[PDB]
Amino acid sequence: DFLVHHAIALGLHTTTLILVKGALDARGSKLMPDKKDFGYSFPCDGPGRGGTCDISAWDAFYLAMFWMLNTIG
Amino acid sequence: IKKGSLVKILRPESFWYNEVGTVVNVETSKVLYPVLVRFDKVNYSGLNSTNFSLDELVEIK
Amino acid sequence: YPLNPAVIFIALIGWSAVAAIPSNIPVLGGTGLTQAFLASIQRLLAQYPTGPKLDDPFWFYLIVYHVGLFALLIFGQIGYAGY
Amino acid sequence: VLTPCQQSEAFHKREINEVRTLENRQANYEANSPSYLALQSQIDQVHKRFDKYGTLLCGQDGLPHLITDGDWRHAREFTIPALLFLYITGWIGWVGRSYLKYTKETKNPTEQEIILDVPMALKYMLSGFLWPLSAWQEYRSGQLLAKEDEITVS
Amino acid sequence: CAETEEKYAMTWSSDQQHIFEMPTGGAAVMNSGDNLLYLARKEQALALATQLRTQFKIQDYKIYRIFPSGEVQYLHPKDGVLPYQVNKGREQVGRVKSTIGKNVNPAQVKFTSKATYDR
Amino acid sequence: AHTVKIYDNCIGCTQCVRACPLDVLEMVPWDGCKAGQMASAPRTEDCVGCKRCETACPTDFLSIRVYLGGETTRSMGLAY
Amino acid sequence: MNLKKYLSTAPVVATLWLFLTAGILIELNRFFPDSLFY
Amino acid sequence: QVKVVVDRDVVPTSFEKWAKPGHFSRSLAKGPKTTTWIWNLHADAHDFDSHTSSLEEVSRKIFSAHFGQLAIIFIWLSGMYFHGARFSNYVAWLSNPTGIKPSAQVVWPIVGQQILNADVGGGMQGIQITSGLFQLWRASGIVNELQLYVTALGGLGMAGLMIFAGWFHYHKAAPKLEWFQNVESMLNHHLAGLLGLGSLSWAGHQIHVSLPINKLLDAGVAPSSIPLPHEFILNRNLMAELYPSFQQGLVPFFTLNWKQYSDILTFKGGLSPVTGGLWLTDVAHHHLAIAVLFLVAGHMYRTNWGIGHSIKQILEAHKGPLTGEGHKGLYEILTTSWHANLAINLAMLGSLSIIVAHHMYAMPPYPYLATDYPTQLSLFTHHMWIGGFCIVGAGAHAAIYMVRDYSPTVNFNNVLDRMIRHRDAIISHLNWVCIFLGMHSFGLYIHNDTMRALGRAQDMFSDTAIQLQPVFAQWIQQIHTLAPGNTAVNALATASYAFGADTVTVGSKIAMMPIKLGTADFMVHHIHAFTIHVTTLILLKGVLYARNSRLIPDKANLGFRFPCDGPGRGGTCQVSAWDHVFLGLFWMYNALSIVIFHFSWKMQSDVWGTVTSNGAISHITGGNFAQSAITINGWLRDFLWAQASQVIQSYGSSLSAYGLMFLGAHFVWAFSLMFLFSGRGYWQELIESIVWAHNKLKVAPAIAPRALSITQGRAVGVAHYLLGGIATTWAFFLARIIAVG
Numbered sequence A: 001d002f003l004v005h006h007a008i009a010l011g012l013h014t015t016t017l018i019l020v021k022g023a024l025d026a027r028g029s030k031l032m033p034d035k036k037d038f039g040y041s042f043p044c045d046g047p048g049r050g051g052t053c054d055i056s057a058w059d060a061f062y063l064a065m066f067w068m069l070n071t072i073g
Numbered sequence B: 001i002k003k004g005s006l007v008k009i010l011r012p013e014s015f016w017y018n019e020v021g022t023v024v025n026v027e028t029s030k031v032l033y034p035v036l037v038r039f040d041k042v043n044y045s046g047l048n049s050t051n052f053s054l055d056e057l058v059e060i061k
Numbered sequence C: 001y002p003l004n005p006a007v008i009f010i011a012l013i014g015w016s017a018v019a020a021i022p023s024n025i026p027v028l029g030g031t032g033l034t035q036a037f038l039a040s041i042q043r044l045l046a047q048y049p050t051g052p053k054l055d056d057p058f059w060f061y062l063i064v065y066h067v068g069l070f071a072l073l074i075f076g077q078i079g080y081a082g083y
Numbered sequence D: 001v002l003t004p005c006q007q008s009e010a011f012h013k014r015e016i017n018e019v020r021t022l023e024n025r026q027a028n029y030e031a032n033s034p035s036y037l038a039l040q041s042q043i044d045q046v047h048k049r050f051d052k053y054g055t056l057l058c059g060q061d062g063l064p065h066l067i068t069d070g071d072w073r074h075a076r077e078f079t080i081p082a083l084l085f086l087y088i089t090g091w092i093g094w095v096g097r098s099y100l101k102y103t104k105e106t107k108n109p110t111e112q113e114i115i116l117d118v119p120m121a122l123k124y125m126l127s128g129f130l131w132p133l134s135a136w137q138e139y140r141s142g143q144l145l146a147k148e149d150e151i152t153v154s
Numbered sequence E: 001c002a003e004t005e006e007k008y009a010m011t012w013s014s015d016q017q018h019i020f021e022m023p024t025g026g027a028a029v030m031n032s033g034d035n036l037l038y039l040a041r042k043e044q045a046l047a048l049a050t051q052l053r054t055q056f057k058i059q060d061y062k063i064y065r066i067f068p069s070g071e072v073q074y075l076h077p078k079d080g081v082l083p084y085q086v087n088k089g090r091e092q093v094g095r096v097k098s099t100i101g102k103n104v105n106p107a108q109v110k111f112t113s114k115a116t117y118d119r
Numbered sequence F: 001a002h003t004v005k006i007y008d009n010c011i012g013c014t015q016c017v018r019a020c021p022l023d024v025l026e027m028v029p030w031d032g033c034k035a036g037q038m039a040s041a042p043r044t045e046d047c048v049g050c051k052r053c054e055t056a057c058p059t060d061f062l063s064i065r066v067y068l069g070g071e072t073t074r075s076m077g078l079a080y
Numbered sequence G: 001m002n003l004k005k006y007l008s009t010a011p012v013v014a015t016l017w018l019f020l021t022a023g024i025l026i027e028l029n030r031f032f033p034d035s036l037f038y
Numbered sequence H: 001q002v003k004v005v006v007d008r009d010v011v012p013t014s015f016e017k018w019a020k021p022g023h024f025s026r027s028l029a030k031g032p033k034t035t036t037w038i039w040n041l042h043a044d045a046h047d048f049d050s051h052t053s054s055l056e057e058v059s060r061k062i063f064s065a066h067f068g069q070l071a072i073i074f075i076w077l078s079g080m081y082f083h084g085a086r087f088s089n090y091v092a093w094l095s096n097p098t099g100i101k102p103s104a105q106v107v108w109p110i111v112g113q114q115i116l117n118a119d120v121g122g123g124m125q126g127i128q129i130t131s132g133l134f135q136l137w138r139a140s141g142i143v144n145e146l147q148l149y150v151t152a153l154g155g156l157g158m159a160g161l162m163i164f165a166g167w168f169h170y171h172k173a174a175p176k177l178e179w180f181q182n183v184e185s186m187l188n189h190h191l192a193g194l195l196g197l198g199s200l201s202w203a204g205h206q207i208h209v210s211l212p213i214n215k216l217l218d219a220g221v222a223p224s225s226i227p228l229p230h231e232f233i234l235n236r237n238l239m240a241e242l243y244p245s246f247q248q249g250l251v252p253f254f255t256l257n258w259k260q261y262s263d264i265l266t267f268k269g270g271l272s273p274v275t276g277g278l279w280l281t282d283v284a285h286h287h288l289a290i291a292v293l294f295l296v297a298g299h300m301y302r303t304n305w306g307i308g309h310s311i312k313q314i315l316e317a318h319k320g321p322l323t324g325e326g327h328k329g330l331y332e333i334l335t336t337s338w339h340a341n342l343a344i345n346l347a348m349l350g351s352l353s354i355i356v357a358h359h360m361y362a363m364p365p366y367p368y369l370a371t372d373y374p375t376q377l378s379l380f381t382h383h384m385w386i387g388g389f390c391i392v393g394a395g396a397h398a399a400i401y402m403v404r405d406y407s408p409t410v411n412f413n414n415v416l417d418r419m420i421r422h423r424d425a426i427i428s429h430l431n432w433v434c435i436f437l438g439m440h441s442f443g444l445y446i447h448n449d450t451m452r453a454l455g456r457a458q459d460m461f462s463d464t465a466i467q468l469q470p471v472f473a474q475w476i477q478q479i480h481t482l483a484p485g486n487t488a489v490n491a492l493a494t495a496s497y498a499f500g501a502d503t504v505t506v507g508s509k510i511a512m513m514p515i516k517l518g519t520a521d522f523m524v525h526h527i528h529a530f531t532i533h534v535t536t537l538i539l540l541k542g543v544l545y546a547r548n549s550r551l552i553p554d555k556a557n558l559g560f561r562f563p564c565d566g567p568g569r570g571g572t573c574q575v576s577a578w579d580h581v582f583l584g585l586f587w588m589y590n591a592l593s594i595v596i597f598h599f600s601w602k603m604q605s606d607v608w609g610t611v612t613s614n615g616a617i618s619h620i621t622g623g624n625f626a627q628s629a630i631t632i633n634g635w636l637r638d639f640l641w642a643q644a645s646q647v648i649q650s651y652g653s654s655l656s657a658y659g660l661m662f663l664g665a666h667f668v669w670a671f672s673l674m675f676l677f678s679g680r681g682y683w684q685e686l687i688e689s690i691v692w693a694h695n696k697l698k699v700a701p702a703i704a705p706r707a708l709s710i711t712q713g714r715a716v717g718v719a720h721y722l723l724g725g726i727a728t729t730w731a732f733f734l735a736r737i738i739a740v741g
């Protein structure tokens, strides 16, 4: 019960790290502050400024769905 | 305003928003962004030296 | 590209007769290399569903005959490279 | 139910099981074998291992559980390595912070983190020992924190 | 294909029979005097323009955009001028008054057919 | 079409035009900078939107922004 | 002269130091094995 | 012509440039303004063809780095001979090999891990060897520990000669490019000097060491009455009793009376039923055949004396009409670029390593190798995986040659770029073959899966159902049964017992059994044809589309490790020639995962196991392949679930480290996925949101903490996918068969 319930709280806090991340950095981050202009599920910003794979607010969904299935796992 | 002055920025989209930096160039030739400022740390493009206007340009003492 | 498709049959005598008269006894063919095949096709030719995987002188002298026959007709087309 | 561990029966069954099960490997070698001597020292490392758990709380499994309430009857379980550990990583955190606020003002700060100034590094490595009342005296000075650093839009 | 899609016909001239590389792939013969080249899409053609221009002098070159109704267009060069070189004939379109910092929030563009930068 | 908009950080250092492999961007003489240049994007119907411009745009934050708009034949960049 | 400057880099110091703390734990777990108290 | 032109005192040997990390690249000596300088410090650390375009300075760097590699290999082999000397039970193993399990590494006694010391007999415990070194040493004739200490000492001595060698060839005597592009001499000395004198001198070792010693051990003499290998050469009278052909000397050699050497050298094949390995008479005769045949093979390259070929006049004469120009250009391709040579040599090296794997299960060449099955297993398995990865390096370095060192001027209408003129017709028919083989290699498993699940087992592809007996493999396998009398005329037994006669039982353990291939083995071969064609699809797509695709018509301008082009063209993520190598590593893990899962389960059902009296047979799984390989529930149940029982129940026992390398290697596997699925546009401002928490406390790192780059952030996902996924099968295999074999 101890070690698992800590694992569950790990799942809740990771999954809210992701969701609260790309829900509060949904609008603009210091990588790209243009994010509010592109809508929700825009793909990327290209390789520019280091590379921008999955910057959108849709990524927080896209990754915390893995953490959802894991945590409910 | 002057060259070499340590300047904090007030434009929220710069990488160096609320970080002080040294003024390299001040141009008096009607440029909308005349003040070329470089920094200690570096943004994602590998480029510290950018430029700014006068409203986004706060010196210190 | 196939500029000279002149003859094919010259390979056949070019491959049967170079393997018929050499017997080289203690192998599958106690006779020559091609006599052990042409003798071993007329037993099977008149609509015989036999010839299993243990049929040595037919199946082995299929591949060991055609792998030299193919090569010698291909080299027969190389026999129209000097033209 | 948390029984005291020295009198839990299934705990002593784990004692018999690991001593005897480890002794099943001891039934291969002669009396002067170095392997056999290693299993002598290993049986020592099982009886000492189980007698030195005399004040834990092995429950119904015979496995020594812990307590994290700070009951002061179980402070040697958790809270004493808690204070010890927070001292060690308050050391490490204070050394890292003091070294970075050294090399933030050098000639080439980018070079200073590749190639550590082992002079000034092993200065701070040792000098961060009294970090509770050095962070408490820098925190009253208005120097531990910062203000008006970088942020995104809003 | 040529029945329904735009074939881009890069035309150019040279001085010597050199060897360039196609955007299709593999080397090409490079007729010395004057030669055309029908291509598929524009990035192939201007990638060939960078393929030639970063090597050596290949100028007086431009693709005629063959569109399947029949007529041509003039890409690249447009104005006998190289595009990063400044000619005082190109009229600017595609600018706004300031940076991103004065773009409106998309909750002001919401339920309207505008863009988040139009001001 | 991918709407390419070129803001007023554009100090006219022409890495955009030299970086774009499509000649959608040119340089326009604009007396607002030190170099007197500011890029323009007239032929955004040919614009792929590969954002190779925004890689080589050495402004503070991205004078030239490439908004991913419609997808025509040329803007999808398909060969056939 | 510059050899110590190589011995002051990030991975070399990290191995001469994590080798040392790893030696603290391994030598401190032969001498005091099975330390669940304190 | 041929001469040796070597610069002396080239580079000073100071420690000064060690204090400048990233001295080597002018694009990288700027100093780290970001942490991506750190990782690019290592990925550019061996871009020798990207430091400077000067091929001389590059070629000095690589040719000196080779001696660093051989220095690590001699440190490694000296490690194996010393761990055989000091730590191993090899002298005890040499008494009875079928009883004592081989072990070298004796785990230090700290908390718990002394339980990893497996009581493997020999009066001494320790973790069990599966690398099979002892079987290499009994074949070598190493009798007591002194030759292992001495050969480890010579291993360190050769390691010192390689360190001093590479130091000597970068700094104070380093050759010109005219030395390096002397390729007729390089082949002329590797075909003859390396391989030729290697196999000839090794035939000398086997005849004058291994044949008398492994005749005395074949008689069963303990390693005390065996004399030194040494003591067989001082007098022939200790060998004339063992082989009377040594009494005649070399006189029947020089008189060409080579009938007299039938005692020393023969052509038997098969397996010695006492030792379970090859006859070392056959193996020494074999290395004489490589000796004369390679030493003849060396002398086909004209160097100084106008006798031999050049590569140029060979390649130019193959000017065939369907290629037009012929091979005009490849000698300038393969003597100017190193990545091209690395593509060829890695392809042939890896495929040689797979050939090594097959020829070690089915013709076990070392004595008592097929009697301890883990060494029989993993020496198959390991030479598969380096047998795999080195192919993908081909697909890497044939791509890099197409990106970096390709030149259309020298390479105009030849055999090379005429492929690239129809690379759509290459990749399109690889595409068709991949889908055809995928349907007809895996749809048969979904088919038999459903038909066994729908109850209609008559409609499967079993033995009893619709049979798919592999006709050609059974037929040519029957030709190999009929080898030693018919066509291999002077043979006695077959080429292997994976083909022909009755099995070989050595100490109630089955050395090699005639493998039957029926209607399940068929479908696994079409798996292997399939997953070989997919990696050939990705690694020919990565070379033909390496430079100018019709999607992106400038990849030569972008580079090799570029991530992408952008969201344009609807998105062009993962499009570079590097990215196809990134995918070829996953499909490498697939293709070899099912090569070894085909191995380690057909050869636990159809070869391995024990025998009892009256010649009775008992496999490890007990014939449970052909009724169970045809589905996937039979595959996953009967192999990946049932064979886990000796890995998963391994706690408390000596196999338990594998039970730790089973779980944790799952971990790393799944830990790969975080790098594969996400991207750095998330992690960069997650990290920067943590950089807020450091800027608040003035713990701002001076080297600015970026996320990983895209090609790094996926490369690390491959490199954990393979370490995790490979180490799962590693601990599963060795934890399986040690608990039986």
Ligand code: CLA
Pocket (backbone or CB within 6 Å): D092, D093, D094, D095, D096, D097, D099, D100, D116, D121, D124, D125, H689, H690, H693, H694, H697, H699
């Ligand atoms: C200079 C040392 C130093 C200090 C004082 C801190 C302090 C902090 N970090 Mg941390 N961090 C460091 C180095 C450091 N970090 C390094 C090197 C990394 C990269 C691995 C990280 C990665 C990191 C993450 C990802 C996160 C933090 C967070 C935090 C905060 C919460 C405490 C915590 O869980 O730590 C976290 C500790 C670790 C992740 C591992 C320990 C880091 C190293 C190994 C120990 C320090 C040794 C250092 C190398 C010594 C250098 C100086 C010496 C050579 C002279 C705290 C302010 C968290 C935060 O924002 O909370 C508010 C958070 O999410 N840190």
Ligand code: CLA
Pocket (backbone or CB within 6 Å): H063, H066, H067, H070, H179, H180, H182, H183, H185, H186, H189, H190, H192, H193, H194
């Ligand atoms: C017949 C002579 C001979 C022999 C035996 C070798 C052997 C070797 N060469 Mg080599 N080479 C030769 C002639 C020879 N070469 C000539 C004439 C040229 C010029 C055209 C080259 C050019 C060349 C290059 C460019 C490279 C090699 C490499 C290698 C190594 C391949 C790795 C290997 O198989 O590991 C097996 C290892 C061994 C069998 C160990 C053998 C070492 C012993 C001491 C024999 C070495 C003899 C040595 C040449 C004597 C130096 C003479 C000097 C004192 C005057 C191998 C050691 C590659 C390598 O790894 O670099 C080292 C490599 O990149 N060679």
Ligand code: CLA
Pocket (backbone or CB within 6 Å): H431, H434, H435, H436, H437, H438, H439, H442, H443, H446, H534, H537, H538, H583, H586, H587
């Ligand atoms: C289990 C997961 C899985 C599966 C099934 C596949 C399947 C495939 N991959 Mg693949 N791939 C995977 C994971 C997978 N991949 C992963 C994880 C990676 C990461 C590296 C890749 C990377 C990769 C690359 C890089 C490439 C492929 C390609 C292919 C195709 C090879 C051709 C073939 O086998 O056709 C046969 C199809 C099958 C065996 C799938 C099962 C179909 C059954 C047999 C029949 C149809 C079922 C049913 C009748 C459907 C109708 C009913 C329904 C409508 C209701 C094939 C579709 C290649 C490709 O795209 O072109 C060849 C290619 O180039 N894959």
Ligand code: CLA
Pocket (backbone or CB within 6 Å): H439, H440, H441, H442, H443, H444, H446, H447, H450, H459, H466
């Ligand atoms: C791709 C692999 C594969 C293959 C070979 C088969 C084959 C078969 N399945 Mg099947 N099956 C598969 C995958 C496959 N399945 C999968 C993946 C599923 C689950 C999604 C199923 C589910 C399934 C069910 C549920 C059933 C079958 C059944 C059958 C059998 C009869 C089906 C039939 O009428 O064929 C249809 C064949 C054709 C329409 C002909 C097309 C193919 C021709 C031969 C191609 C020829 C091209 C030619 C060579 C071109 C060159 C010539 C040209 C140049 C002139 C047959 C043995 C049935 C059965 O009872 O089994 C006995 C049945 O009930 N299957």
Ligand code: CLA
Pocket (backbone or CB within 6 Å): H266, H267, H268, H269, H270, H278, H281, H282, H283, H285, H286, H289, H290, H293, H359, H360, H363, H364, H365, H488, H494, H495, H496
């Ligand atoms: C007569 C000398 C001789 C002898 C005694 C051996 C003996 C052996 N070889 Mg062999 N081998 C030889 C010559 C010889 N080889 C030659 C000349 C080659 C190169 C073509 C090879 C290539 C070779 C490979 C690749 C492998 C062996 C292996 C083996 C071992 C397996 C046991 C067996 O049944 O093999 C019997 C050996 C054979 C049937 C090989 C016959 C090769 C003939 C002589 C080639 C003649 C070439 C000639 C130019 C004519 C070409 C045309 C021809 C194909 C019709 C055995 C020790 C295997 C091994 O490593 O064991 C684990 C293995 O994988 N050999």
Ligand SMILES: CC1=C(C/C=C(\C)CCC[C@H](C)CCC[C@H](C)CCCC(C)C)C(=O)c2ccccc2C1=O
Pocket (backbone or CB within 6 Å): G014, H674, H675, H676, H678, H679, H680, H683, H706, H707, H708, H709, H710, H712, H713, H714
């Ligand atoms: C997690 C993750 C990161 C973050 C990884 C971080 C940046 C690296 C963490 C490991 C480094 C090495 C930790 C740094 C620690 C230093 C070595 C110092 C610590 C002290 C000792 C260990 C020496 C990415 O950058 C990334 C990029 C692209 C796709 C996916 C991902 C991704 O999944």
Ligand code: SF4
Pocket (backbone or CB within 6 Å): A043, A044, A045, A046, A047, A051, A052, A053, A054, H563, H564, H565, H566, H567, H571, H572, H573, H574, H679, H710
């Ligand atoms: S890969 Fe991810 S980041 Fe690089 S371009 Fe394609 S999408 Fe943008």
Ligand code: SF4
Pocket (backbone or CB within 6 Å): F009, F010, F011, F012, F013, F014, F015, F016, F017, F039, F056, F057, F058, F059, F063, F064
């Ligand atoms: S915007 Fe950036 S790129 Fe475009 S011109 Fe001005 S500087 Fe050169």
Ligand code: SF4
Pocket (backbone or CB within 6 Å): F002, F004, F019, F020, F021, F022, F024, F025, F047, F048, F049, F050, F051, F052, F053, F054, F066, H568
């Ligand atoms: S959008 Fe893509 S194509 Fe149009 S300019 Fe910017 S980068 Fe070049």
